[PDB]
Structure 1
Amino acid sequence: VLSEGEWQLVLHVWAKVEADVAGHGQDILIRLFKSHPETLEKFDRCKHLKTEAEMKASEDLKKHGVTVLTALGAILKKKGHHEAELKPLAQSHATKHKIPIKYLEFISEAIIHVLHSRHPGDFGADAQGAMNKALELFRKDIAAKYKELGYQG
């Protein structure tokens, strides 16, 4: 359980993300794909991309960054009361996309990296620790639902 103050730090920096969801989503996915290229294999429409400029020009990558950040922002705004939001996401990521928890760790790392890079004044130690706790809670809860669905990833 995060404190109310921790949730407010999470949501304060998330408002900054919402000023340009697509640009943030591009930076986060490009960071993920650069730092962990095996993750790029999961995206059929993006897996041929080679350079940073190609990734920034990609309409498919830009759309998918928005898909991810829209779902995650709704989850964060539930302040841990996210079972109904995780249920469809666990469903598809366990049984169709087959996204192991370690890949969710990689993308959480990329999110933290981009938020620190773009919003350092709203992402000091207090806010980083809160965001870390929020993403850890997301990964804990979705791992439990993965297993309920028969997926040990």
Structure 2
Amino acid sequence: ELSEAERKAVQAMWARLYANCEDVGVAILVRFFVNFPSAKQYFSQFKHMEDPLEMERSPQLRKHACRVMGALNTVVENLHDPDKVSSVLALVGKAHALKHKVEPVYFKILSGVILEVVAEEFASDFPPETQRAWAKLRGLIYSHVTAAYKEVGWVQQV
């Protein structure tokens, strides 16, 4: 669950990744909405944009990219401060369960998409001990997020 080594491997990798916050977050979102056009339903601005071209460029989408990337950054950066991470995700988890009401599973799905991009950006040096280190940040994120959902006794509505 993220050694000292792992924590730095992920950290360096994301560092070079976040220095591109902009295009990378957008590529993730746009790609998430193409694979699962139904998570687009939660966004009142994309619920209808179907052409990933309109998306790719849109300043709002770019905004939600800004947010997702920023939050992840805080997690990754304070990845050694159990408390800090637990907090950013609790805050993020409850906002999505109670305010936006995104069914929890999308998180896991959205995380895979994120790693897919990471793995592509570093297809050059994506080692087993490193890919294995990202799988943790992934499982760490989700469980934390579903803990928030669980604590609020989440039920999605009809």
TM-score over 0.5 for the pair: yes
| Alignment correspondent of 2:2 | 2
In 2, the alpha carbon distance for the partners of 1:55 and 1:23 equals 12
> Contact 1:46–1:60 at 8 Å: present in 2 too?
no
Deviation at 1:100, TM superposition (A): 2.4
Deviation at 1:130, TM superposition (A): 0.8
| Alignment correspondent of 2:14 | 14
| Alignment correspondent of 1:150 | 153
| Alignment correspondent of 1:68 | 68
Does residue 87 of structure 1 match 2:90? Answer: yes
> Contact 2:90–2:144 at 8 Å: present in 1 too?
no
| Alignment correspondent of 1:136 | 139
| Alignment correspondent of 1:124 | 127
Indicate the RMSD between aligned Cα atoms, in angstroms.
1.6
The DSSP-based 3-state class of the residue aligned with 2:66 is helix
Deviation at 1:76, TM superposition (A): 1.7
The answer for unaligned runs of 5 or more in structure 2 is none
The DSSP-based 3-state class of the residue aligned with 2:47 is coil
Query: Which runs of at least 4 in structure 1 moved beyond 4 Å after TM superposition?
Result: none
In 2, the alpha carbon distance for the partners of 1:88 and 1:141 equals 10
Deviation at 1:152, TM superposition (A): 5.4
Deviation at 1:126, TM superposition (A): 2.6
Q: Output the TM-score relative to the length of structure 1.
A: 0.92
Deviation at 1:141, TM superposition (A): 1.4
Name the aligned partner's letter for residue 93 of structure 1: H
The DSSP-based 3-state class of the residue aligned with 2:38 is helix
Q: Output the TM-score relative to the length of structure 2.
A: 0.89
In 2, the alpha carbon distance for the partners of 1:152 and 1:115 equals 32
